[PDB]
């Protein structure tokens, strides 16, 4: 009888809404594996952003409400989630417009037809699945030129297009205040249209010079090391001069360096360190023979319930015999059935996804029956404490090898122990400079209002280092296409995980002088720390109503002034991996360093 | 009738498909049209839809104007899987599984194929949805039903 009522009646649709869409998002990646065809990409092209206009109805009733300032914290930090500013200046007819454009440009971009069996290398880059088998190949020329190539004879006609799309957004664009599209997830990251916990004007035309100028010596000396490691523990089959092969970042972005781990192994053939003997006899997924085998002895006596041991119907081969191109949509309705949606290749950025998803679905078995408000949670501390501490946990190798289930064939000598130890001084503020520039970077290159005239100082790196297209003078600016790939479609934004940087350091601080098991300070073990990850498990349930880890504010600390102790607790360490390469001139920075 | 929406993408000509292959074989000269629009609210109930049911595949490929009035044991491997969905063999039936909320590439969509037969018989059926008005006692030219 009031408005009110009626309102949350359209939420809750909204709400069904969004989950039989994700069921949708599940139901045909399940079809399509009970089937041999492929057209469902199609529906990816169309239907999916067209689910984002139906989001512009919230807008019109969010913006001139006062309701920013809840009481509950809880409450106003979902509401800064979920309702941010958005991209609502466009017209009916110009939303059209660019919708249409956006997705004819995404069905030009998506439907790559080159990817093939029989192609050596040249395959499909946007969807990955064997493109990363059979092109491991040596002819690292042809790699290059045929990419680069391909990359040109798609590209140079688009540029007239792209040059349409610039000019179009820059009638507006200088006050649109739009940075990166993953807010449209998290929201709460970036405050558009006033000040907030994000750099500011005048934050900014400080920060230029005291944290630019702070953090530009170790920069200069962590990609000088890069340059040195990758130019000479690397063969010298190319010129160091020229451009770097973007192969080795891996993914597109390349901002998961930890990948390097992964692919350091340069053999791809001989088994390596995983559980593929299911794999190359019954062509099938081995995990969970493990999980249920780890298991018949672990009791702890008298639980309160049993949640371990549901699904005790034997199943073989829940799906394709043979696995088809592999995409990540892993999404499963539960209660009703359960087959595994995403492939396993080896990536630990895969790793951590799969992680994060198993941690999701586990939540869904007991919260399918609670609205979608309180579905997910809301601060990345809870996502950071169920995701990654279980992949460290179960990233110790003395347990599989303990036992002895393979062959006892091991190969380990000082190369591994020292990729390991760059490994982990790649998760300290090392790391940070590199996300914040790009960070910057993004923000600034979308204003159209920075001079051009200068390019060779801070512009001249962008070409030959990021996208490695090879070019006589990089001296344009029309290239600008990753600025606007595909995942925008998906936020893969990895910010999400950038407290990580910091977080996970305390944690070590809680442990690394508490348990102190045999080793010294160097190396740090953490092993025996699934049971630390999995005993939250036991009141989530409980503590949805006062989440704790929302309370507190320790994720930052004080801008306003500079922490001496903070500083240099690690001098000798910092120092060590500062000073020892012969190659770093030690003082001023030199104004032309053509090595660098 | 109703299909899935996905279904509509995979009949084309010389494509591949569920319908195209396994349930209905276009003829080389159709001559009709199909009339289709989201039918949320019509097919779909909100205590879900699971009396609808579908076959994957099929032995042979239905003709036209041919209804496929079997449902036998289907056994896609060389050894008796007993209807086990598992190694080389597969469940013949499938859930269709349609709810109001679905999304537009996978919505109940309607199909209405109006295949003009010629049977041998003549013409006694009739779509006329132009009937226009009638004005009387001035020379015009007239037409009712054929004549």
């Not at chain 1, 009733?61 to 009481?71: D, V």
């Not at chain 1, 309180?374 to 946990?393: D, K, T, W, Y």
């Not at chain 2, 003549?122 to 006692?137: D, E, F, I, Q, R």
Request: proline letters at 5%; charged letters at 20%.
């Amino acid at each position: 009888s009031t408005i009110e009522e009626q309102a949350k009646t359209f939420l809750d649709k909204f709400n069904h809404e969004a989950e039989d869409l994700f069921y949708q998002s599940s139901l045909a990646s399940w079809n399509y594996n009970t089937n041999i065809t492929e057209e469902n990409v199609q529906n990816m092209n169309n239907a999916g952003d067209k689910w984002s206009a139906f989001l512009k109805e919230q807008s019109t009733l969010a913006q001139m409400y006062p309701l920013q300032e809840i009481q509950n914290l809880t409450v106003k930090l979902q509401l800064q989630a979920l309702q941010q500013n958005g991209s609502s200046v466009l017209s009916e007819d110009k939303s059209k417009r660019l919708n249409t454009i956006l997705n004819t440009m995404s069905t030009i971009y998506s439907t790559g037809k080159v990817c093939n069996p029989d192609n050596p290398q040249e395959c499909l880059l946007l969807e990955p699945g064997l493109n990363e088998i059979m092109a491991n190949s040596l002819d690292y020329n042809e790699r290059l030129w045929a990419w680069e190539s391909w990359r040109s004879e798609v590209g140079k006609q688009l540029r007239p297009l792209y040059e349409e799309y610039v000019v179009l957004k820059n009638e507006m664009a200088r006050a649109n205040h739009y940075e990166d599209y993953g807010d449209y997830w998290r929201g709460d990251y970036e405050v558009n249209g006033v000040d907030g916990y994000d750099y500011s004007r005048g934050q900014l035309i400080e920060d230029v010079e005291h944290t630019f100028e702070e953090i530009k010596p170790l920069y200069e000396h962590l990609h000088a090391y890069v340059r040195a490691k990758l130019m000479n523990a690397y063969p010298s089959y190319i010129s160091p001069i020229g451009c770097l092969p973007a192969h080795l970042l891996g993914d597109m972005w390349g901002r998961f360096w930890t990948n390097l781990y992964s692919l350091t192994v340069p053999f791809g053939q001989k088994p390596n360190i995983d559980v593929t003997d299911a794999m190359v006899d019954q062509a099938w997924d081995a995990q969970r023979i493990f999980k249920e085998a780890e298991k018949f002895f672990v009791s702890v006596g008298l639980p309160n319930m049993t949640q371990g041991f549901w699904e005790n119907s034997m199943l073989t081969d829940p799906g394709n015999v043979q696995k088809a191109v592999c995409h990540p949509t892993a999404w499963d309705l539960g209660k009703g059935d359960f087959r595994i949606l995403m492939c396993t290749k080896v990536t630990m950025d895969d790793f951590l996804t799969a992680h994060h998803e198993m941690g999701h679905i586990q939540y869904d078995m007991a919260y399918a029956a609670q609205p979608f408000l309180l579905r997910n949670g809301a601060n990345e501390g809870f996502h950071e404490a169920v995701g990654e501490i279980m992949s460290l946990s179960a990233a110790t190798p003395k347990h599989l090898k303990s036992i002895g289930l393979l062959s006892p064939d091991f190969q380990e000598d000082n190369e591994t122990e020292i990729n390991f130890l760059l490994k982990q001084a790649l998760t300290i503020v090392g790391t940070l400079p590199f996300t914040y520039m790009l960070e910057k970077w993004r923000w600034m290159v979308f204003k159209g209002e920075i001079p051009k005239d200068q390019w060779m100082k801070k512009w001249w790196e962008m070409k030959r280092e990021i996208v490695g297209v090879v070019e006589p003078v990089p001296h344009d600016e029309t290239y600008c296409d990753p600025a606007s790939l595909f995942h925008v479609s998906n936020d893969y934004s990895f910010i999400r995980y950038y407290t990580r940087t910091l977080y996970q350091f305390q944690f070590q601080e809680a442990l690394c002088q508490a348990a102190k098991h045999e080793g010294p300070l160097h190396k740090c073990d953490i092993s025996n720390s699934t049971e630390a990850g999995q005993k939250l498990f036991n009141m989530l349930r409980l503590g949805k109503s006062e989440p704790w880890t929302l309370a507190l504010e320790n994720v930052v600390g004080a801008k306003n002034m500079n922490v001496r102790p903070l500083l240099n607790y690690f001098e000798p360490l910092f120092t060590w991996l500062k000073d020892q390469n012969k190659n770093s001139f030690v003082g001023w920075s030199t104004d032309w360093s053509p090595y660098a | 009738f109703v299909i899935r929406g996905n279904e509509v993408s995979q009949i084309a000509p010389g494509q591949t498909g569920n319908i195209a292959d396994y349930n209905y074989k276009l003829p080389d000269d159709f001559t009709g049209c199909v009339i289709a629009w989201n039918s949320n609210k019509l097919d779909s109930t909100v205590g879900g839809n699971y009396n609808y049911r579908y076959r994957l595949f099929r032995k042979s490929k239905l003709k036209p104007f041919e209804r496929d009035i079997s449902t036998e044991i289907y056994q896609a491997g060389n050894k008796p899987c007993n209807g086990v969905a598992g190694v080389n063999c597969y469940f013949p039936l499938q859930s269709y599984g349609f709810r109001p909320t679905y999304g537009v590439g996978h919505q109940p969509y309607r199909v209405v194929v109006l295949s003009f037969e010629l049977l041998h018989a003549p013409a006694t059926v009739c779509g006329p949805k132009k009937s226009t008005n009638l004005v009387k006692n001035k020379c015009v030219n007239f037409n009712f039903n054929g004549l």
